[PDB]
Amino acid sequence: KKRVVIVGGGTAGWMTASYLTAAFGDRVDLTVVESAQIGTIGVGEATFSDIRHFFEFLRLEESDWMPECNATYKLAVRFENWREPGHHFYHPFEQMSSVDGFPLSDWWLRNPTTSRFDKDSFVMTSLCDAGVSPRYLDGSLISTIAEYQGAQFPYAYHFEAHLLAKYLTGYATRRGTRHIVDNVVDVALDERGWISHVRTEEHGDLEADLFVDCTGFRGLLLNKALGEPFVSYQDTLPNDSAVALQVPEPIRPCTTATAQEAGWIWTIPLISRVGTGYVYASDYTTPEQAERVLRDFVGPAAADVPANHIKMRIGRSRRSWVNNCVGVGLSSGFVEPLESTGIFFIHHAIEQIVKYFPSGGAGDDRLRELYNRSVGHVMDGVREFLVLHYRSAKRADNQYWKDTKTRTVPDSLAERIEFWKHKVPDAETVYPYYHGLPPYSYNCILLGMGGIDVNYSPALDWANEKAALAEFERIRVKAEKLVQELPTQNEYFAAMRA
Amino acid sequence: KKRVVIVGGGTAGWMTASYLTAAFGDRVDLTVVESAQIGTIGVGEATFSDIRHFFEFLRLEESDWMPECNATYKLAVRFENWREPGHHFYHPFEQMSSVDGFPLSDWWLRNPTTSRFDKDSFVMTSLCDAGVSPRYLDGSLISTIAEYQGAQFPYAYHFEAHLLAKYLTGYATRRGTRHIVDNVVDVALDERGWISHVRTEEHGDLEADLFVDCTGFRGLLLNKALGEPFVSYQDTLPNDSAVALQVPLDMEREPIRPCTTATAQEAGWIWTIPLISRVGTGYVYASDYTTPEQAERVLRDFVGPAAADVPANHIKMRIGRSRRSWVNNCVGVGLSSGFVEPLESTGIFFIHHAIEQIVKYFPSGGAGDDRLRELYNRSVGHVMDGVREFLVLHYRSAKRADNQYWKDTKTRTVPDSLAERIEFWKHKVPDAETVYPYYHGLPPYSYNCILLGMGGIDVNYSPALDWANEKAALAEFERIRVKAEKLVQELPTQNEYFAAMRA
Ligand SMILES: Cc1cc2nc3c(=O)[nH]c(=O)nc-3n(C[C@H](O)[C@H](O)[C@H](O)COP(=O)(O)OP(=O)(O)OC[C@H]3O[C@@H](n4cnc5c(N)ncnc54)[C@H](O)[C@@H]3O)c2cc1C
Numbered sequence A: 001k002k003r004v005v006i007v008g009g010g011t012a013g014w015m016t017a018s019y020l021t022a023a024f025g026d027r028v029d030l031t032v033v034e035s036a037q038i039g040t041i042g043v044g045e046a047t048f049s050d051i052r053h054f055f056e057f058l059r060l061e062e063s064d065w066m067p068e069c070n071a072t073y074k075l076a077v078r079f080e081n082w083r084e085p086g087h088h089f090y091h092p093f094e095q096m097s098s099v100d101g102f103p104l105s106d107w108w109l110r111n112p113t114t115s116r117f118d119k120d121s122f123v124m125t126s127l128c129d130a131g132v133s134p135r136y137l138d139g140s141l142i143s144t145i146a147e148y149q150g151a152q153f154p155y156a157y158h159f160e161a162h163l164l165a166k167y168l169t170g171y172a173t174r175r176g177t178r179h180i181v182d183n184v185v186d187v188a189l190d191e192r193g194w195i196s197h198v199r200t201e202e203h204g205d206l207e208a209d210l211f212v213d214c215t216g217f218r219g220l221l222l223n224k225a226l227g228e229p230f231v232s233y234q235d236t237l238p239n240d241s242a243v244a245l246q247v248p249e250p251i252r253p254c255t256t257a258t259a260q261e262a263g264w265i266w267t268i269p270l271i272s273r274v275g276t277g278y279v280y281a282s283d284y285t286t287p288e289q290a291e292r293v294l295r296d297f298v299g300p301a302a303a304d305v306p307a308n309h310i311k312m313r314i315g316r317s318r319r320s321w322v323n324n325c326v327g328v329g330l331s332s333g334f335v336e337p338l339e340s341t342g343i344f345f346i347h348h349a350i351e352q353i354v355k356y357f358p359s360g361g362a363g364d365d366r367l368r369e370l371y372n373r374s375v376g377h378v379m380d381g382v383r384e385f386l387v388l389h390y391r392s393a394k395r396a397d398n399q400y401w402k403d404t405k406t407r408t409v410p411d412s413l414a415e416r417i418e419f420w421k422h423k424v425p426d427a428e429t430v431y432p433y434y435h436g437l438p439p440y441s442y443n444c445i446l447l448g449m450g451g452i453d454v455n456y457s458p459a460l461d462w463a464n465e466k467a468a469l470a471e472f473e474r475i476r477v478k479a480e481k482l483v484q485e486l487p488t489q490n491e492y493f494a495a496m497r498a
Numbered sequence B: 001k002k003r004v005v006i007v008g009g010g011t012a013g014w015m016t017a018s019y020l021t022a023a024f025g026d027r028v029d030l031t032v033v034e035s036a037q038i039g040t041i042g043v044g045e046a047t048f049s050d051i052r053h054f055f056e057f058l059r060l061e062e063s064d065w066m067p068e069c070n071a072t073y074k075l076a077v078r079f080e081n082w083r084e085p086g087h088h089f090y091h092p093f094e095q096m097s098s099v100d101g102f103p104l105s106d107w108w109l110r111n112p113t114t115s116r117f118d119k120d121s122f123v124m125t126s127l128c129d130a131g132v133s134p135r136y137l138d139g140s141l142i143s144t145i146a147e148y149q150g151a152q153f154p155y156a157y158h159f160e161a162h163l164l165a166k167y168l169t170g171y172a173t174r175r176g177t178r179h180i181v182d183n184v185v186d187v188a189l190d191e192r193g194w195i196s197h198v199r200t201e202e203h204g205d206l207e208a209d210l211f212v213d214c215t216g217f218r219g220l221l222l223n224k225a226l227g228e229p230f231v232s233y234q235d236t237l238p239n240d241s242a243v244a245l246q247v248p249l250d251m252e253r254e255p256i257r258p259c260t261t262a263t264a265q266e267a268g269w270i271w272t273i274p275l276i277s278r279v280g281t282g283y284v285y286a287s288d289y290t291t292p293e294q295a296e297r298v299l300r301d302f303v304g305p306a307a308a309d310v311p312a313n314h315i316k317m318r319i320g321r322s323r324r325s326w327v328n329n330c331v332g333v334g335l336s337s338g339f340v341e342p343l344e345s346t347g348i349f350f351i352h353h354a355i356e357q358i359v360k361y362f363p364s365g366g367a368g369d370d371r372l373r374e375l376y377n378r379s380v381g382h383v384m385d386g387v388r389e390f391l392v393l394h395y396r397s398a399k400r401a402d403n404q405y406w407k408d409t410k411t412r413t414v415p416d417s418l419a420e421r422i423e424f425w426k427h428k429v430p431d432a433e434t435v436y437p438y439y440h441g442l443p444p445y446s447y448n449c450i451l452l453g454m455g456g457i458d459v460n461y462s463p464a465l466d467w468a469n470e471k472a473a474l475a476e477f478e479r480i481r482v483k484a485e486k487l488v489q490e491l492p493t494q495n496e497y498f499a500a501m502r503a
């Protein structure tokens, strides 16, 4: 009978408790200890293509939780002004078809229907441009995380972080999770360096077979108590700061990432407000200037809203599971939210905690090794993907954007980029370990950002293009039909609440 | 405009010609040169989970080609006597379900319904045991190769190799392939080491933008002319020889079993490939442990009196792969590129993958061509290296240890990465995280089937399954059991199915 103690009551702590509750029911003992004094990070409002697995694993329907979390649909990230002023493109959550053995991006490079690869190749692009729900009013859409990401439309969500945490708190406590409001004030280690207990101020000492560090950037257990080194990603991704605001027509079904002079601004539309933030590199602009740029970007509704200034710890713990302690969430690592991967890292982590859950006996070192390899691959792969956003962005208007082309690139990515100049990204040339990103994602960024010239495959000069023309026409016909038929998110969620 | 000259008219040459015809039509000029005097290898009659992509790419229906090739269905490989005498198990061409994030093999280890993982977890196992067709008499089953292998039932075929070659010859020649029957007697190189032409005995010199070496083990262009080194796999897979028979049988006497059988022997294993009118059979063996004469005797004894007066085909195998399969303007396809023993019938898979990749990385003649060749070589090298690991696992996990040969399977070299995987697999059944990470045509369920069937390595179920609710897993095992018992009562035999196809 295993006991798990989760330290931290942010999104990471309550996702962990709820997921473990859904996986193990009352057969594993779960305790969350969270501080009333120490706040959560206060952001984290957009998700990634994994996310439908999480809510379905909890056996929750969208109507169960979306109204309570002011949640909306996220069908894509909309990138504005990365290639050039006034240009936008999408990374949509939608599989890219292959025709006669070549991805649609290859055919598009040879014979584009329009100048917009995303518009020609994915229906979700038109839904985002039109501002419609992916689901009809009758509810219809137009087991592992990986399998859910393989769905035709593996869409995601926007939500209020605090409301999701409160929702998941009720979900987990109603299903047996013990909820302690207290500070962990000491982490006691035994002679072999394992955690023997966490000491609280008022609830005594908590023992467990597994301690989950969900304490955020501070990494109280994994980093402080166990001394696990942290590996910076700042050589390749200099953005180290953010300033965020919550500020009270069709709701656009995507996150917007609008490139700025020293970083980029997110727009996350919720049911009753917008979450917004400027992620920036402090070497290139000040917190004062970044807040000014953000408030100016939002406009007069951002006048007297309080700013949340955040210094980010960018990188990952060398190992996320050390002895009897596993870091989940910001304690394990973090990269800038350009593709909204933080909750994906949490979700992946907790799926892997279940997968590699220890017995207490033989094999546990190998299970921990596999766990650590899996989470390290996800973060290292995503880091490559994020670097590609900056390395392929065409804009070069100032020192910041010029430096994206000269700074460190992971060596393996540099080689992939050289291949991608003549073969569009595919399974052979993408980071080969699971990191949540199928090849179409790389295609969307590479072609959208527009800074690297990509050649279509010479074979397409001799292949008959009839099937490819037919597939582009099918997508165009479907997109124009869907845009006329689907309701807005406003109407959809009004009916859901009703 | 572009010119491709294919040297060799075995399975590799005509698969290449027909595939390029289907990919490019008449927009590329194709020539096959093949020797009337140098025969083909004379074996290669079972295929792999990739294969339905090939025929569909050529826009062929099963009724178009199967009767002409005396073809049958291959739903699995049946491994006999590898674990222990009298034991069999399958590697079936059927996806393995996962329940609540764990593969069915994990749940089976915790709570097996029967002692047979393959019977409990795959419907195709029962079809093979029962000897029935995967398709009803009405034809119903119960764009890239990888996507075809992802089908629920990515089944394969048996066929007469020479009849398939003849069929593909007609297919390609009727669609514009020039067919030269002649010997290539010289391969001339230009100053930069590229092939300038191939000289034939009677048809002059042939130039091309791309030469495809389909000359078999001899590798006339890739290994001889261009000097490309060959990398032996014999450290890990010692089987180096084969003796084969084609045995006519009244295959209408009894149901044709829808699988290849691999029956372990004292110094290797014997294949049985059932066709419409005969059986292809052969003994793959290690020459250090038995002689050709003893191997032929064992094979003839295994087949029985129907092998009387049937001539034996003794084959020395070249086991390994070319260091690079595409060098300058020459790409090796088939045995010229590499070979591993046919334990999982992967040779035609290698050809099929190679020709798909030839189309994928087809050169322009200009910038980028070195990178395209690099990607091609990496892709085919990963396929062969991954399949090598998978084959080694058959021997490394086989329980039988009754003689020196089978004892030596446990002490022989194992690729270091596979040795590490095996240590993980003792506590986590194979999955995407632990299997060879590059495409090699083998999803994780394949590793599970071999690991659990061979029975020589103890595997523990995941500790999490002690706390996970097993209702959904029991429901899935029951669903498979119910479906399998229904299907075996309803499906026709292959005999009936193909009799109606011919009608
Ligand atoms: C600027 C920014 C933008 C982001 N945008 C996104 C996005 O769009 N999408 C996304 O998915 N993710 C996003 N993320 C990531 C996301 O915020 C985190 O992945 C997620 O919120 C989980 O945070 P956490 O629970 O790990 O840490 P926190 O929110 O910091 O929670 C830490 C918890 O530990 C508790 N704690 C700390 N010390 C103690 C102690 N001694 N005793 C008891 N309790 C203690 C605290 O009280 C708190 O409950 C963003 C992050 C940042 C910084």
Ligand SMILES: Cc1cc2nc3c(=O)[nH]c(=O)nc-3n(C[C@H](O)[C@H](O)[C@H](O)COP(=O)(O)OP(=O)(O)OC[C@H]3O[C@@H](n4cnc5c(N)ncnc54)[C@H](O)[C@@H]3O)c2cc1C
Pocket: B007, B008, B009, B010, B011, B012, B013, B033, B034, B035, B036, B037, B038, B039, B040, B041, B042, B043, B044, B045, B046, B047, B048, B182, B183, B184, B185, B214, B215, B216, B217, B218, B220, B242, B244, B282, B315, B317, B333, B334, B335, B336, B342, B345, B346, B347, B348, B349, B351
């Ligand atoms: C024992 C054994 C069992 C096998 N079993 C299977 C199996 O079950 N499944 C499977 O998929 N694969 C199997 N394989 C592999 C299979 O045989 C090959 O994948 C396939 O037959 C392709 O052979 P090839 O065309 O490359 O060579 P070959 O059949 O040797 O053909 C070579 C061709 O090149 C020609 N040639 C050679 N030199 C010259 C010259 N100078 N001029 C002109 N022409 C020339 C020959 O005449 C011939 O046409 C097996 C192989 C062996 C050895």
